[PDB]
Amino acid sequence: SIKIRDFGLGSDLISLTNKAGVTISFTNLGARIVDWQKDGKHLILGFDSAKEYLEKDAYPGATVGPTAGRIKDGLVKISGKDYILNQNEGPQTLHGGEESIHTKLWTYEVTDLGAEVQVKFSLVSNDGTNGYPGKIEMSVTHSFDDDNKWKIHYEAISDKDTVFNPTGHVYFNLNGDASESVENHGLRLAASRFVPLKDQTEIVRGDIVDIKNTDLDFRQEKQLSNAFNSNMEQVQLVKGIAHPFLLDQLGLDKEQARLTLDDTSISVFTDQPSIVIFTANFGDLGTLYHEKKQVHHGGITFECQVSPGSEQIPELGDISLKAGEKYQATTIYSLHTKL
Amino acid sequence: SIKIRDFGLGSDLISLTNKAGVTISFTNLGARIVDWQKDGKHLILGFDSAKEYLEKDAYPGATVGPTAGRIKDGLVKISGKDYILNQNEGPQTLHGGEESIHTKLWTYEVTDLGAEVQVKFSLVSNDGTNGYPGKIEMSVTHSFDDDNKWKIHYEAISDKDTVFNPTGHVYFNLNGDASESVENHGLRLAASRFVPLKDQTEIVRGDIVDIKNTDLDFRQEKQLSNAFNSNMEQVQLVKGIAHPFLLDQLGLDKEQARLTLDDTSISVFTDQPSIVIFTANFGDLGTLYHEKKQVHHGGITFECQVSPGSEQIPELGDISLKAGEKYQATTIYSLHTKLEHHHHHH
Ligand SMILES: OC[C@H]1O[C@@H](O)[C@H](O)[C@@H](O)[C@@H]1O
Ligand SMILES: OC[C@H]1O[C@@H](O)[C@H](O)[C@@H](O)[C@@H]1O
Ligand code: NA
């Protein structure tokens, strides 16, 4: 079933319940996932109204872009020309700059295909918005099926050469409660390398590092506590995890990561080359989710995209988007329950 | 009473009924007026869903900006600096550029004050959007009261020195049917001068002209047919009216314009210095409104703003907006019955 309701400030809440009784809901405010629940438990972090997102934290579950992550000094080179983007975190451009696409109300259309339902959100980023050349017509389609697969498919076209590398900012928490650390979840991740950060500004250090046999090697399922109690300087630097992991094998058919807690597991699939993992290292902040005070490590993201820092480490990839080319990306979160 | 429902594509339709039973409705897609009825008759033009606006004509009833009208070659000078804005009408920047504010979903909040209900729409124009320095935090408040007054109040603040001069693009048609020309309406307008256009591209000519005693003189009420039938070069140029009228006396307290049909009148009040009037000179385009094919002259706007062309005719005004300074504008459309005797035939 599909249900549409007012979510506040003019935004809508679109809730989809599949044949299995699983419920997933989205809002056009930022083409974002709001909730995902099974047997009355939430699997992800989310708020109860639009206002909350705007007052508390606008990132959770949102589509961020045009470029996800931090860009040093807000500087990009397009066709050999330097362009300065909106700087909203010190001199860096973080997640597209201030008041980006995650704070806008996107238009949308729902398409019911029976076993699958799609919600297609659309937005035009005007030429010059936050310094980005355009216009860029973007659409993000969130879909949910009877096999419990939540899929995100992005598409974009720009009238001018530009940059584009959006991501989905959902935070998972299989405890179903933000006041409980994800340290107890098990994580498996098909990455042998990572991108270290320079310092507390979170810009990239400049190199690529092999993590085989370190506290960050999750090639074999392991509990998060491990990484959390690690003394690796990188872990210590951010107080948890806040890094881009380079996937070993690219392709949508491969399960790139898996997050497990008891009989409940989440598998991640993507056509992107990297996954940025951030473990809600908020310390004492105590953001309130569903009246529950959030704890440090009270959530974890799987931001699939081209690794941030390619401006400094070209090997990472290239996020350019030439005028007229059609950008496409796909990320899938599959829910499984052991029997 | 206040009512809200989905209007399509994620937009909402907010419908207000005052104590006198007059209903008016708006949508957050473009902070726009959708309909205004009295006794079951449409007083303005509008569509029945959001998609129509996007597919047929996105301007009707919209809030347009950041700058309303045409800016020659999309060039403005801001604090000694030249800025080129998005050019979407040939080399001109028309109503803020392509995919402007009228095409976005604004957030909103409704405030019920009893005899008056306010709908405040908000939106941020990011810095550099369509070439405009910002960011610009905008808000448009549409309100309706028990006195049949529809008021539009604009507010804005910019992080940077920029330009700002938005307007409301409502189209009136007292016939309540787009297929009926407004040549049968009576018009009174407190303006002695107008701004002629250079040519078909519709940029300003460079001069201000006195219209007293011409077919464009509506200081004293006259039927619109008078203008429509005129062979004045300017009328012929645009096939009707499509010009800025300079108000003779400024001030929100003065009735600047009045449009009448039989027992119904609409009075226009504003704090702006001019009114751009466009009479739907679409020829045989025949856009469908409520399944009625719109006729040439099947509608009229009263866009209250600083006249377009100030880039060329400084006398017209200054639309610049200094960083941190608060912009405000107020325009009011008021509805009356039996305000005067208007009994004609066409
Ligand atoms: O991705 C968004 C997040 O990035 C992290 O690295 C920061 O520490 C968070 O405060 C921020 O909300
Ligand atoms: O105000 C916008 C309008 O400008 C007029 O001068 C044009 O002829 C119309 O096509 C357009 O919708
Ligand atoms: Na809605």
Domains delineated in chain B: 1-346 (2.70.98.10)
Q: How far is B136 from chain A (nearest CA, A)?
A: 11
For residue B1, the cross-strand partners are none
Establish whether residue B280 lines the binding site of ligand 2, counting it when its CB lies within 6 angstroms of any ligand atom. no
Quickly list H helices, chain B. 50-55, 225-228, 233-238
Nearest Cα to A129, choosing from B341, B197, B127?
Answer: B127
Q: Are A19 and A46 in contact (CB under 8 A)?
A: no
- Residues in chain B with CB shorter than 8 Å from the CB of A4 are 6
Q: Are B69 and B94 in contact (CB under 8 A)?
A: yes
Q: What share of chain B is helix, strand, coil (3-state, %, to 5)?
A: 10, 45, 50
Name the burial class of residue B54, with classes exposed (0-12), middle (13-18) and buried (19+) by CB atoms within 10 angstroms of its CB: middle
For residue A283, the ligand closest to its alpha carbon is: 1
Nearest Cα to B189, choosing from B224, B239, B154, B233?
Answer: B224
CA A188 to each of CA A251, A256, A273: distance values in angstroms, whole numbers, following the listed order: 17, 8, 16
Nearest CA to ligand 1 atom 6: A242
* Residue B340: other Cβ atoms inside 10 A: 12
Q: Do A10 and B106 touch (CB under 8 A)?
A: yes
Tokens 């440090």 correspond to: A296
Backbone angles phi, psi at A21, to 5 degrees: 90, 5
* Residue A136: other Cβ atoms inside 10 A: 25
Can you say whether the dihedral through the CA atoms of B306, B309, B314, B318 is positive or negative? positive
Tokens matching residue A254:
């491969």
CB within 8 Å of A279: residues ≥ 6 apart: A182, A224, A228, A240, A241, A242, A297, A299, A300
Buried b (16+ CB within 10 A) or exposed e, A201-233: ebbbbeebeebeeebbbbeeebbbeebbebeee
Nearest Cα to B298, choosing from B285, B312, B281, B315?
Answer: B281
In chain A, which residue's Cα lies nearest the Cα of B29? A107
Strands (E), B206-316: 209-210, 222-223, 242-247, 257-261, 264-270, 274-278, 288-289, 292-293, 300-301, 303-305
For residue B277, the cross-strand partners are B243
How many angstroms separate the CA atoms of A133 and A70, rounded? 18
How many residues comprise chain B?
346
Q: Are A256 and A269 in contact (CB under 8 A)?
A: yes
How many residues comprise chain A?
339
Nearest Cα to B273, choosing from B222, B315, B334?
Answer: B315
Residues after which chain B is broken (C–N above 2.5 A) are none
Q: Which site among A32, A107, A122 would you substitute to test the B interface, given the most B Cβ atoms closer than 10 Å to its Cβ?
A: A107
How many angstroms separate the CA atoms of B68 and B303, rounded? 9
Of A6, A100, A128, the CB nearest to B128: A128
* Residue B85: other Cβ atoms inside 10 A: 22
Establish whether residue B242 lines the binding site of ligand 2, counting it when its CB lies within 6 angstroms of any ligand atom. yes
Nearest Cα to B31, choosing from B131, B116, B104?
Answer: B104
In chain A, which residue's Cα lies nearest the Cα of B120? A9
Q: How far is A105 from chain B (nearest CA, A)?
A: 6
How many angstroms separate the CA atoms of B101 and B80, rounded? 26
Buried b (16+ CB within 10 A) or exposed e, B172-184: bbbbbbbbbbbbb
**Single-letter residue type at A73:** D
CB within 8 Å of B23: residues ≥ 6 apart: B15, B16, B17, B35, B36, B37
In chain B, which residue's Cα lies nearest the Cα of A98? B126
Of A10, A97, A98, the CB nearest to B28: A10
Rg (CA), chain A: 19
Q: Which site among A104, A126, A158, A160 would you substitute to test the B interface, given the most B Cβ atoms closer than 10 Å to its Cβ?
A: A126
Rg (CA), chain B: 19
**Single-letter residue type at B59:** Y
Of A63, A92, A238, A278, the one to substitute when testing ligand 1's pocket (max ligand atoms within 8 A of C-beta) is A278
How many angstroms separate the CA atoms of B162 and B132, rounded? 7
Strands (E), A256-339: 257-261, 264-270, 274-278, 288-289, 292-293, 300-301, 303-305, 320-321, 327-337
Ligand 2 atom, smallest distance to B301 CA: 1
Buried b (16+ CB within 10 A) or exposed e, B273-283: ebbbbbbbbbe
Strands (E), A126-220: 136-145, 149-158, 162-163, 167-168, 171-172, 186-189, 191-194, 209-210
Ligand 2 atom, smallest distance to B57 CA: 12
Establish whether residue A59 lines the binding site of ligand 1, counting it when its CB lies within 6 angstroms of any ligand atom. yes
Establish whether residue B203 lines the binding site of ligand 2, counting it when its CB lies within 6 angstroms of any ligand atom. no
B227-230: list long-range contacts, CB under 8 Å, 24+ apart: B227/B279, B228/B181, B228/B183, B228/B279, B228/B297
Q: Which helix (H) or strand (E) holds A60?
A: none
How many angstroms separate the CA atoms of B213 and A164, rounded? 59
Please tell me what DSSP assigns to residue B237. Answer: H
Establish whether residue A29 lines the binding site of ligand 1, counting it when its CB lies within 6 angstroms of any ligand atom. no
Tokens 């029997």 correspond to: A339
How many angstroms separate the CA atoms of B346 and B344, rounded? 7
In chain A, which residue's Cα lies nearest the Cα of B50? A107
**Single-letter residue type at B153:** H
Tokens matching residue A198:
């320079």
Q: Are A296 and A282 in contact (CB under 8 A)?
A: yes
